[PDB]
Design a protein around this ligand. Structure first.
Ligand SMILES: Nc1ncnc2c1ncn2[C@@H]1O[C@H](COP(=O)(O)OP(=O)(O)NP(=O)(O)O)[C@@H](O)[C@H]1O
Ligand SMILES: [Mg+2]
Ligand SMILES: [Mg+2]
Length: 345
């Protein structure tokens, strides 16, 4: 059986097993599962078959959640639809273990070095595992990462489809996206290292590094802090964006000592060395030209991170690679695939 309750602006129809629904993060609520006796998170996906773009995103994220297996990526406990057949099928519900906070809420707590380094180590182990499956994320952000009260971190999502294109000139948080993504260049796996450096820098300051109303505002924030990039970089750009990037003000960049001064880190010797190690890592991750930015593996071996290094976490490959396979189908056909996939669960 199932029943219906309203949580804020949204209605949830779920299985009777799930009780005490309350709002969190709204299409996600917290609940108690009576059968397994644990707190859970329930996310409602309203008509995921509604168009080719929503349908492709829902179906891919459903496949990836079951393909991947790592302690730093959220796992599915259950998935169901309370509708009784295909004709009536409308909504899918995903059920997850309930973590204690999102990474925004954790950053707002003003983290020390032990916690910042451990959370970064786990984010990089997660990314490494995703890359081992052929998934390059491109859209990592703190609101889509959650943390347990013991500091275990889990990435909630899988990012942009390989086809998904981005353009400089044309509702979503974009502040953690790499230069190559926002300028519409090609990308490699280290696109995700830029995002991790943006989060690391925000863990230290508490505020967004490169905020901005649009890609143009965000590019200006990037060059004001880090400096104007090289002519070789600019020459890879498409003509419209190239002309814009070439005719901006010429900035030198601030030294990382000025971008992340000692006075914005946790304390004030032991403190000063930990800040110095963090700056060195930022100087390698927040690098505009991806040809000179470090890799995931080099970041995991870095002095700021490697205090947690454990070969069994780090060398933990995906059981299979994802075949970016997810297909031109009608609305009606997308409905059937998603429905049978949910049933199969
Ligand atoms: N498993 C979970 N444990 C604890 N909190 C969670 C969990 N899943 C989601 N949340 C919380 O709910 C918020 C919204 O979740 P999320 O899956 O990001 O939905 P969304 O932002 O509505 N859709 P998307 O565009 O897919 O990110 C998160 O930022 C968390 O605060
Ligand atoms: Mg979200
Ligand atoms: Mg999502």
């Amino acid at each position: 059986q199932h029943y219906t309750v309203e949580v804020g602006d949204t209605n949830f129809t779920i299985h009777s097993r799930y009780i005490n629904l309350r709002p969190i993060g709204g299409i996600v609520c917290a609940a108690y599962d009576t059968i397994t006796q644990q707190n859970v998170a329930i996310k409602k996906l309203s008509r995921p078959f509604q168009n080719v773009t929503h349908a492709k995103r829902a179906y891919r994220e459903f496949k990836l959640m079951k393909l991947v297996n790592h302690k730093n990526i959220i796992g599915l406990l259950n998935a169901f639809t309370p509708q009784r057949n295909l004709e009536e099928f409308q909504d899918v519900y995903l059920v997850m273990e309930l973590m204690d906070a999102n990474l925004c809420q954790v950053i707002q707590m003003d983290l020390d070095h032990d916690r910042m380094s451990y959370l970064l180590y786990q984010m990089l182990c997660g990314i490494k595992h995703l890359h081992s499956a052929g998934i390059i994320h491109r859209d990592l952000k703190p609101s889509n990462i959650v943390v347990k009260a013991d500091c275990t971190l889990k990435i909630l999502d899988f990012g942009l489809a390989r086809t998904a294109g981005t353009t400089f000139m044309m509702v979503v948080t974009r502040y953690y996206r790499a230069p190559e993504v926002i300028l519409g260049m090609g990308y490699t796996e280290n696109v995700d290292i830029w995002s991790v450096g943006c989060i690391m820098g925000e863990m230290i300051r508490g505020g967004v590094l490169f905020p901005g109303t649009d890609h143009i505002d965000q590019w200006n924030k990037i060059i004001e802090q880090l400096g104007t990039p090289s002519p070789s970089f600019m020459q890879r750009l498409q003509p419209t964006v190239r002309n814009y990037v070439e005719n901006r003000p010429r900035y030198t960049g601030y030294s990382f000592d000025r971008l992340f001064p000692d006075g914005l880190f946790p304390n004030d010797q032991n403190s000063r060395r930990k800040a110095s190690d963090a700056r060195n890592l930022l100087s390698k991750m927040l690098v505009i030209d991806p040809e000179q930015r470090i890799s995931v593996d080099e970041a995991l071996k870095h002095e700021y991170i490697n205090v947690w290094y454990d070969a069994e976490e780090v060398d933990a490959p995906a059981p299979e690679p994802y075949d970016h396979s997810v297909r031109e189908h009608t609305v009606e056909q997308w409905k059937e695939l998603i429905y049978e996939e949910v049933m199969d669960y």
